[PDB]
């Protein structure tokens, strides 16, 4: 309601960024990297992929990659002897890199309430149930 400028702000603001990669002269010291959730809603003419020859996509990691990501967050974390790294990765189903840290953060908050240096195995059981419920919502893809 407030900052809406109509359809005139649409053409002036977007095409201003395109001219910075075209009309604006540079010796090659200026780099422009754009990232977002969905780039399809944006005007494809703004990209002009003669300036940007690199396109990087992203997918969900496999069971082998999640074992390395889990060891990163648990490197500085104190874990008990009954906690297995490969067991937590096996329980991971359709999760991204942020969902792995979400379980490591939730498991730390459970041990923080009881003030435990080494996180026990009971905290990871309640952490994976809260992430898959609220933080992880079923996508609208729905096929298969």
């Amino acid at each position: 309601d407030s900052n809406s400028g109509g359809e005139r702000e649409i053409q002036r603001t977007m095409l201003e960024l395109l001219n910075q990669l075209d009309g604006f002269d540079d010796r090659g010291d200026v780099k422009v990297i754009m990232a977002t959730n969905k780039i399809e809603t944006l005007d494809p003419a703004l990209i002009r992929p003669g300036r940007i020859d690199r396109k990087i996509l992203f997918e969900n990691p496999d069971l082998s990659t999640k074992k390395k990501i889990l060891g990163i967050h648990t490197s500085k974390m104190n874990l008990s002897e009954d906690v297995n790294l490969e067991t937590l990765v096996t329980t991971k189903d359709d999760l991204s890199g942020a969902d792995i840290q979400a379980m490591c953060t939730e498991a730390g908050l459970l041990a923080l309430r009881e003030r435990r240096m080494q996180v026990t195995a009971e905290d990871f059981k309640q952490a994976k149930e809260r992430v898959m419920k609220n933080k992880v919502e079923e996508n609208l893809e729905g096929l298969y």
Binding site: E40, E129, M132, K133, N134, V136, E137, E138, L140, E141, G142, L143, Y144
Partner: protein, 244 residues
């Protein structure tokens, strides 16, 4: 011209999916929650009505459940308007198989004939797909007890425990760990009562907002008995199971 007002219902998106079908799946989350359970001796179906109050008529009504056959039940989760179109055509196609082959229709044939209707609007006709989902449960002497579900996209798969509607992934979490192959009919009722209580938006749980229609097998083998639980019998199982 008619090309400008057309919203292009069925078109392939750059992501490779359909716009109207992707948005129709969200409408299921805005409707009641229907959770089916397939036990060893029968099939237990659960449902919860949306927008209920004291002025509602609890005497005879079923919003989320219907009966398409003597041996086959159905669970309706989605828009009620688009549901009656597929339900009326369901009993027509079910009796046509009984009128010709003179035998009870299984669930696998009944669902695939109804799914082709939903698959038709997603291809031709230039219309919107049905925004209602169904759960088909029936008895058969071929594969035994069969529990299937549908989607606005027109696909059906086998499910031992299925959950649709609001909080889909929240209910399936408790159903996966608590499911057992030896679970009987009585133990399957307690699984649905504990699931619908924690996944709702209210504090307590009454018998006016729930619907349960199971499939029981009597002493005579080969024929089951379709029994829809009346509100008098729904409040009785809540006390025996400790839900209250």
């Amino acid at each position: 011209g008619s090309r400008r007002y057309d919203s292009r219902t069925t078109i392939f998106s750059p992501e490779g999916r359909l716009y109207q079908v992707e948005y129709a799946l969200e409408s299921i989350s805005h409707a009641g929650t229907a959770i089916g359970i397939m036990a060893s001796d029968g099939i237990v179906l659960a449902a919860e009505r949306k927008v209920t109050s004291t002025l509602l008529e609890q005497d005879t009504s079923t919003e989320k459940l219907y009966k398409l056959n003597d041996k086959i039940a159905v669970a309706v989760a989605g828009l009620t308007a688009d549901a009656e179109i597929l339900i009326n055509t369901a009993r027509i196609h079910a009796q046509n198989y009984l009128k010709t082959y003179n035998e009870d229709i299984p669930v696998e044939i009944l669902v695939r004939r109804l799914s082709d209707i939903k698959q038709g609007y997603t291809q031709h006709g230039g219309l919107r797909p049905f925004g209602v989902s169904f759960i088909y449960a029936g008895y058969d002497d071929r594969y035994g007890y069969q529990l299937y579900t549908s989607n606005p996209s027109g696909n059906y798969t086998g499910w031992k425990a299925i959950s649709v509607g609001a909080n889909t992934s929240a209910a399936q979490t408790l159903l996966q760990m608590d499911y057992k192959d030896d679970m009987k009919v009585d133990d399957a009722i307690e699984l649905a009562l504990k699931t619908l209580s924690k996944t709702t938006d209210s504090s307590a749980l009454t018998y006016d907002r729930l619907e349960f229609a199971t499939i029981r097998k009597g002493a005579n083998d080969g024929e089951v008995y379709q029994k829809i639980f009346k509100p008098q019998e729904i409040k009785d199982i809540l006390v025996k199971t400790g839900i209250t």
